């Protein structure tokens, strides 16, 4: 009942990134325990307003996982990230999307 | 047939303190969600038009009420017994129960429980089996719960008599979505450099359904054993995403290709060719 597990965070696009073409940004957060968690998608460091997410699930080892996603249109200069807060983290963890 | 072969419900019950607990629940075919639980109403959310399988509205409503009473009573009893079981808050209990169709046609049922992210109990042969990770607490729990007349019998009926017919009914009822074929798209990119003088190449495969898929880095007809398969990741709307990487020396990237096979492609593989010197995307 006592060891907690910190979230793994993976950020990826639904389709290959083409600047100016609409796409979907995914953040998959997994391997964590306990279940309470805060997940935001960022554009240029700012929180994106309309993000969808899956209902809570867990893997066979009892670690929880969630998918957060939103429409986005990649550009050459804009940045996107996934920001996660969890009891195992003293500060929010930010993982940036990187098409390369 | 392709697609999921199992059905299960899950429970996550989070006990903040002695007077506040909340439960989330849902129903699943493998990793595809088909039922939600609405705590506002104590009823289920049917995510697909076929989510009730071949069950009548009346039987579905009886099962929803079983779950509603169980969810409330589970929290009530855990909170009443938490002192005797020397529980420290906060803590979190998980459960999964369901059944699955195997090769040869047998349907096997299962029920597993966890406390603090560790196995606590399972049901084997309609009996409560404490897990070693659960210690004496799990032994104490199993001896207490089996004395609950009705609970033992209701769990037996649900696992061994209700679930198998529900599973077959819903696999049939949902076959238009569960056995559909969705073609992947694929593309190449750089990966993080593994170190001095080396490159990582990435073959991305996205949007395929069902989940089985084959991806390999190739030199002509020679499969590269160094190919590293990532973990399969979800997309929204029931498709999957996968990265296959290869770490190579700088001067050995030329000549590489990525080949993708999938059930939806009817034998017409996708082949992508890596080109060096920044010529990789017209
Ligand atoms: C939801 O669907 C379930 C699955 O239906 C089948 O599969 C789907 C995909 C479609 O193809 C359907 O057309 C198809 O029926 C239903 O459950 C199944 O119901 C049938 C009855 O319709 C039942 O068949 C009976 O089986 C017994 C033997 O069962 C024992 O032994 C087998 C191994 O041999 C074992 O697997 C079982 O677990 C049992 O231990 C047999 O005695 C029956 O024979 C009698 O009836 C037949 C005609 O049906 C007649 O010719 C005979 O002469 C004799 O009178 C009959 O073959 C399946 O076993 C059962 N499958 C499962 C996994 O339970 C489900 O039906 C409902 O529940 C059933 C248990 C039964 O009470 C039905 O009356 C109910 O409507 C259906 N609906 C719901 C609400 O769940
Ligand atoms: C899969 O599940 C089967 C169905 O429950 C189970 O069979 C049951 O096994 C029970 C023993 O574990 C047995 O209980 C006994 O019942 C008799 C009266 O019929 C009773 O005298 C006896 O009481 C004594 O023992 C108790 C502790 O076991 C004790 O508390 C009590 O005070 C007293 O000292 C005992 O309760 C059931 O009768 C039996 N039921 C059926 C329908 O078979 C399987 O386990 C056993 O299976 C066979 C019986 O077919 C036996 O050879 C073995 O005992 C098996 O362990 C179970 N399978 C497995 C692998 O465990
Ligand atoms: C369309 C989709 C269909 C889905 C298909 C189905 C697939 C689902 C597969 C499997 C589903 C498994 C269901 C779990 C709940 C069943 C028990 C229950 O609900 O009882 C009642 C709650 O009774 C209570 O309020 C007590 C709650 C304390 C819980 C203790 C933990 C039990 C863990 C288990 C440890 C295992 C121990 C060993 C087990 C051998 C519910 O209310 P009721 O029905 O009105 O009253 C029944 C009265 N009775 C309880 C006296 C009977
Ligand atoms: C028991 O825990 C309750 C709920 O905690 C809230 O939800 C959890 C999921 C977790 O995220 C937690 O941090 C949340 O705070 C407490 O109720 C909360 O109390 C606090 C502050 O006192 C208040 O911020 C929350 O709004 C409230 N949650 C509710 C009401 O949904 C219990 O605290 C008591 O209830 C308060 C309303 C207040 O009367 C206070 O005096 C009580 O202590 C927790 N109780 C105990 C014994 O600690
Ligand atoms: C159609 C509708 C679809 C509707 C589907 C959608 C939602 C429905 C899902 C809800 C139901 C889920 C059932 C999940 C299965 C199994 C239950 C798991 C068992 O849990 C445990 O492991 C118990 C762990 C207890 C930890 C020990 C510490 C607590 C000690 C307190 C003592 C309690 C003693 C209680 C005795 C009684
Ligand atoms: Cl950012
Ligand atoms: Cl397990
Ligand atoms: Cl509820
Ligand atoms: Cl104890
Ligand atoms: Cl029942
Ligand atoms: Cl490409
Ligand atoms: Cl080899
Ligand atoms: Na109390």
Residue numbers in the entry:
A (entry chain B): 1 to 100
B (entry chain A): 4 to 285
The authors write:
Human αβ T-cells recognize antigen complexes formed from MHC proteins bound to diverse peptides, CD1 proteins bound to diverse lipids, and MR1 presenting small molecules. Although the four types of human CD1 antigen-presenting molecules (CD1a, CD1b, CD1c, CD1d) are related in structure, CD1b has distinct cellular and immunological functions. As compared to other human CD1 proteins, CD1b shows particularly strong recycling through the most acidic endosomes, use of a particularly capacious cleft to capture large lipids, and it is uniquely expressed on a subset of activated macrophages in the periphery. After identifying a distinct pattern whereby T-cells respond broadly to phospholipids in preference to sphingolipids, we solve the basis of this response via a ternary crystal structure of a CD1b–phosphatidylcholine–TCR complex.
To characterize the extent of antigen and TCR remodeling during BC8B TCR docking, we determined the crystal structures of the CD1b-PC complex to 1.7 Å and the unliganded BC8B TCR to 2.0 Å. Similarly, upon BC8B TCR docking, the PC antigen is lifted from the CD1b antigen-binding cleft in both the A′ and C′ pockets, allowing for significant TCR contacts with the sn1 acyl tail. The PC head group is lifted upwards by ~6 Å and bent, allowing for favorable contacts as the phosphate moiety is inserted into the BC8B TCR cationic cup. CD1b presents several abundant-cellular phospholipids, including PG24, PC, PS, PE, and PI. Comparison of CD1b-PG and CD1b-PG–PG90 TCR complexes shows that TCR binding resulted in extensive repositioning of the lipid, with the TCR β-chain moving 7 Å toward the PG head group and vice versa, pulling the antigen up slightly from its fully seated position in the cleft.
